[PDB]
Amino acid sequence: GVFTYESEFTSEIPPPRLFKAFVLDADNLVPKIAPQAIKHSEILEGDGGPGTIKKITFGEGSQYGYVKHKIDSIDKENYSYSYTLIEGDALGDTLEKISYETKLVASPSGGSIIKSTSHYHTKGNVEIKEEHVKAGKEKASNLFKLIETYLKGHPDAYN
C-alpha cells in the first residue's frame, strides 16, 4: 500500500551549506533560487523543527498552487532531513499521507553526495501512477541542482 522511491546523486557544493539552506532556510531557499517554481514559504506550526507544518506555494498553473509539509526529522550532524506532506494537488484523492526523506554526505572527490527518498500512503485501496511519482523524481533532481547552484553562485546565502 505504501510506495518507496529514492534518488542518489552528488554536488560540487558542501552539504552543510545546502543543509542550512534547504532546512534551516527552506522558507528562504526556494523563494531565493527560483520564484518560478514556488510563490513563497510560510511555516504554519512549529518553527522549522519536527512537528512544524510548512505551507509551500506554487506560482505555476492558472489555479492556485501550494502544499503543506510536516517536518519529520533531520540530522544536523549528518546533514539529513525528512518531512511528511499532507497536501498537494498532485496527491489527489488517491494519496493521503506522504513521507519525504533526504540525506547529505561528502565524496572522496571533494564534492558532496546527496541521497533522497520518498514514500506514499494511499487511502481507500488506491495506488499512484508512475507518471506521478516518476515526475517527482525529475522535479526533485532539478531542485537538488538548484540548491547546490544557489550556494555555489550565492556565497552570501547563509554561507
Q: In this structure, what are the phi and psi dihedrals at residue 90, rounded to the nearest 5 degrees?
A: -75, -30
Distance, in Å, from the CA atom of 134 to the CA atom of 157, rounded to the nearest integer, reads 31
Residues sharing a CB contact under 8 Å with residue 113, sequence separation 6 or more, in sequence order? 8, 9, 10, 15, 104, 105, 106, 107
CA triple 45-51-53, angle to 5 deg: 40
Domains of the chain as residue ranges with CATH: 1-159 (3.30.530.20)
Distance, in Å, from the CA atom of 156 to the CA atom of 21, rounded to the nearest integer, reads 11
CA triple 123-51-76, angle to 5 deg: 115
